[PDB]
Every structure is written in C-alpha cells, then in structure tokens.
C-alpha cells in the first residue's frame, strides 16, 4: 500500500489555501502555490507525508482532519497570516488507514 | 469494473460548482478548485467515492443525482454559501451501476 | 469499433456551447465547462454516449445533428438559458454509423 | 500512409479562423475554438477528413487550398459571419496526395 | 537522419512572428498562432518542410537564414502586414545539413 | 537512492520566490521563473543539487533549511532585491539524508 | 553523456530574458519566447548547443557564464535592445564538463 501511497504523494498530493481574516483575493498563481506549500510544510501532520515510506496510530487516525487552518507568517509577504486549506486525499487516506 | 472505476476516479472525476444566491463571479481558478473539492467532500455521496474499492444498493441507485446543491460554509471565505454543482460521471456511473 | 468509439469518447468527445439571447459573453472558463457538460447531459442524445458500450438505428441515424440547442435552466446561475452548441465528432460518428 | 494520416488528424488537424468584416477581436478562447470547429465542419472539404479511411482525385487535388473563407452564420452568436481560416495540414496533405 | 528530422518537425518545428511597422501588440494567442502558421507556409523555404521526407543543395544551404521577413497580406485581418519571424530549427538544421 | 534523487531533481525540483521589501507584485510568469532560477542558484546550497551524482555531512545536514532568504541584484530588472523562497523537497531530502 | 546531454537539450534547454534599460514590461508570452530564442541564438556560445554532438576545451570551460547580457536589435520590435538572460543548464553543464 505504501507504494500506492507514494504514487498518490507524487501525483495528487496537493492542498489549496485561501486567507481568512479580511471575493477576489488579488493573489497570483505563484503566490497561491507558495502559500499552499508553506501550509503543507507547517500545518499538515507529518503522518500524511511519512505514510508511503512506512508501508501509536490510535491517536494518528483522529489527529488529521480534512480542512485545516494555518497561521503562516507571510504577513507583508502575501498580506495575510490565517489561511483555511483543504486537500482531497485527506478522507481517502483516512479510509485507507482505517482499512490499514 | 472497479479497476476501470478507479481509472475514471483518477483521470476525469471532477465536479464543477457555481454560487446560487446573488454573469461573472469574480472568482479565481484557485477559489473555483477549492469550492469544487469542498463540495465534492461534503455534498457528493460517499458511494461515488467508494465505488472503485468495492469492485443495500436499491436506495443507493436513486440516492445520487446529476446536479447537486451544497450549502458550504465559506462566508467571508469565498462570499457565497449555496453552490449548484454537477459532474459528468454522475449519469455515467448511474448507468454503469444499473448494469452492475 | 466500439473500443475505438470509447477512445474518441475519452479523449476528444467535447462540445462547446454559447448563449443565444442577447461578442464577449463575460463567462469564465469554469462557467463555460459547466455549461458544456450541462448541455451534454441534457441536449445530447443518449445514443452518442451509449454507442461505445454496445460495440432501431434507422431513427437514430437521423435523430442527431451537428449543431444543437439547449434551453438549460441556468438563469440567474450563468445569466443565459438558450445555448447553441456543437461538437466535432457529430458528423464523424454519423459517417461511422452509416458505415456501421 | 492512411495510418500516418489518422495519426496527424488526431494530433495536428487544427484550423484557425479570424473574422473578416469590421487588431483585437474580443473573442475568448472558447469562442475561437467554437468558430474553428464550425468552419472546419462547413468549409473544409470532405476529402480532407475522409482521407485516413480510404488509405476522381484529379478534381480533388485542385479542390482544396491552404487558406479558406467561410460565411458561417454566427451573427449575434459570435458577432461576425465571414471568417478567414487556415491549417498547416493543407499543403502537407496536398504534397502527400501528389505523391499518393 | 530524416526520421530524426521529422521528429523535430512534429515536436519542435515552431516559428515566432512579430509585426514590424508601427511594446504591446494587442494580439491574442489565436492571432499569434494564425500569423505564425501563415508566415511558416509563406516565408519559410520548402527545404525546411521537405527535408525529413528526403532522408542542387549548394545554393540551398545558403538559401535560408535564421530570421526572416514576410509581408503577409493580413490588413484588416490582424492590422499588420510586415512580420519578422524566426524558428528554432534554422541554425540547428543548417548545422545538420552542413554535416549532411 | 541517488537515481531516485535525480528523478526528483528532474521532475519536481522547483522553488518559489516572493519579494520581501515593500498583495499583488505585478510580476509576470517569466519574471517569476527567472527569479526562481536566480535564487535557486545562489541561495540553495550546492549539496541539494549535487546529491544525485554522489549517490563531512554532519554540518551539511543542519546547513540548509526549508525557507531561505536570497538577496539578488535584479533591481531595475524585476524591481526587488530581497526575496523569500521555499521549495517542496527541502524536508523530504532532509529526512532522506537523516535516513541516509 | 552526449546522449544524456541531448536529452537535456530537448527537454529543459530554455532561457529567460528581461530588458535592462528602462516591474511590468508589458510583453506577451509570444514576445518573451521570441526574445528568448533570439538571445539564445546570438548570445549563448556555440559550445552549449554543440556539446551533445561531440559526445581546446580549456578556454571553453571558462568561456561561458550563467547569466549573460545580449544587445539584440529588436528596438521598435519589442521596445528594448539590451537584455539580461539566464539558462538553468549553465552550472549543470559546467560541472558536467569539469567532470568531462
């Protein structure tokens, strides 16, 4: 399953982030990708990233949720700090892990 | 069939959503993708996602429809809550399942 | 032929729809794709979709045409209801079927 | 040859159309593609499309030319009727046919 | 070599054209591609196209150059007639032919 | 591992850079890519680049960090000198190296 | 190595150019590609292109540098003559050549 997991990680492991504190946001695609990857690095739990190398989990199953909030310190960098984000494979990996 | 089902799930399984309560919507592509995946996670029935892993269905056949509505709580996030959505694989998978 | 037909279905089976009642239309690509799939589900005849699963046809050959009109109920949703649409494989599939 | 021809018509059989009667034209990419396929269906001679199924030609060789004009009736639909169009496959397939 | 030549022809044989007589030019991508193919058909010498079918050349080697000028009659069509153009295969195929 | 490392280097070795000293920045995609390449060359340590040719590291493991600052002299070229940059594979390669 | 070198030349041998004498530059992507190819043809040393055909080099190793300045005569064509340009394979091929 871990091999299939790394196929998912390479192909479709993407998250999408939009700012919360204040609907156009006047951010370009480069800024959007930068914010997404920053929130992936800081907000998403390390289990999501480390799962495909693997193939204590009792707390891990309930640890990760679908939608997340990250207070990424890009104030004066993108104009916002609080960002709400989501990623489609959250529930997919949750079901996989409940099966796994 | 289930292998074919996960093929369609990987390649062409996207839904499209547009707001209802009030034609430009001044929403960028990132916002559109975020709304699409949010409504896919919330509005779309779990059978649509879980079909390719399997390969009680009597109510499940009539459960889903082509066009759906999601009242996704993204106020001050994208500016709208009610979103009308559709995806091409709705009727396709309905026909496949009636055959299946 | 039916395998070839589903090849054209997956790769190049695309239709394009433009509003009729009143040349920019101030519609984004997401709205265009939504209208395309909506009219594909509604206006396009079920034979066009169901041809590659088979592989009464006397009425089917003259049933469909190249250009179509759909009065899709997207008023206050996209701003127009009447849409004229066309798709390239219409005449191609008509020729195939006349051969087939 | 005909197999090669079907390869080209899948990959590079694209025509481009621009309106004649009156340099921005304020037409979106969807409208451009719609006009392209419309004029391809109406203006381009059936020999160009039907060549890869074959593999009387004396008139066919001089029948088609590189650039074409189509008076496609999309007035109040895209804003123009007369369109000048061209595709790179015209002279290439003419040379192929002269060889063939 | 001719097989390799037709490989570069299918993948990378693209030319770029810009108008001369008078830096934004307010031409869309469709118009740019149309001008590119028009000047490719007109300005570029038939050796560039016909090389990969082959595999008198003494003057033919010095015939073509990297950049070209073409006065394509697209007045009231794109707004300019004189276009300076260049393609990536010019010096590459010149070296290939000097070797060949 | 080093072969896999060069697979990542070819596929997904990308960085994103945003200006620091003062949220739109009115920089095009070409300028964004140029800034990314500059800061990838000057800010990213040579070990990140040279890892896939190898396959003293005690200081090298703690040498690099996820987010970096790059002070590149493109003033009057893109309008800014200080940029903050990040790349996806920083943590992945740090974990790989710690395992390695 | 030369086979690998021509793989890089086909895939990722691209350069980026921005004007120097005077941050938006109001140049479209077609103009950007045209400027890039012009400067690649004139500025980049013939060794960079001719390396994958071979596979006197003592001066060649120090001959080229990563960033270049090229004074391309497209005044009244794109609005600028002086351009600073870069290409990603500079340091990579310099290391390869020092090894080779």
Author numbering:
A (entry chain A), B (entry chain G), C (entry chain F), D (entry chain E), E (entry chain D), F (entry chain B), ...: 38 to 59, 99 to 131, 279 to 323
Quote the original article:
Volume-regulated anion channels (VRACs) constitute a diverse family of ion channels that are ubiquitously expressed in mammalian cells. VRACs are hexamers composed of five closely related paralogues of the leucine-rich repeat-containing protein 8 family (termed LRRC8A to E). In contrast, when expressed on its own, the LRRC8C subunit forms a larger, heptameric assembly with weaker mutual subunit interactions and a different preferential arrangement of the LRRDs.
In the framework of a large-scale, exome-based genetic analysis of patients with rare undiagnosed disorders, we identified a 1-bp heterozygous insertion in the gene LRRC8C in an Italian boy (P1) presenting with marked skin telangiectasia and gastrointestinal vascular dysplasia, microcephaly, intellectual disability, skeletal dysplasia with fragile bones, and eye abnormalities including optic atrophy. This DNA variant, NM_032270.4:c.1197dup, p.(Leu400IlefsTer8) (NC_000001.11:g.89713767dup [hg38], NC_000001.10:g.90179326dup [hg19]), produced a shift of the reading frame leading to the change of Leu 400 to Ile and the insertion of six amino acids followed by a premature termination codon. Like most variant-induced interruptions of the coding frame located in the last exon of a gene, c.1197dup (from now on, ‘LRRC8Ctrunc’) is predicted to escape nonsense-mediated mRNA decay and result in the production of a truncated protein product. In the case of LRRC8Ctrunc, we found a similar behavior as for full-length subunits, with a monodisperse peak eluting at somewhat larger volume, which is consistent with the smaller size of a channel that lacks its LRRDs. In independent datasets of each mutant, we found an equivalent heptameric organization as for WT, but also distinct differences in the observed structural features. In both cases, this is manifested in weak density for large parts of the protein, which likely reflects an increased molecular mobility as a consequence of altered subunit interactions.
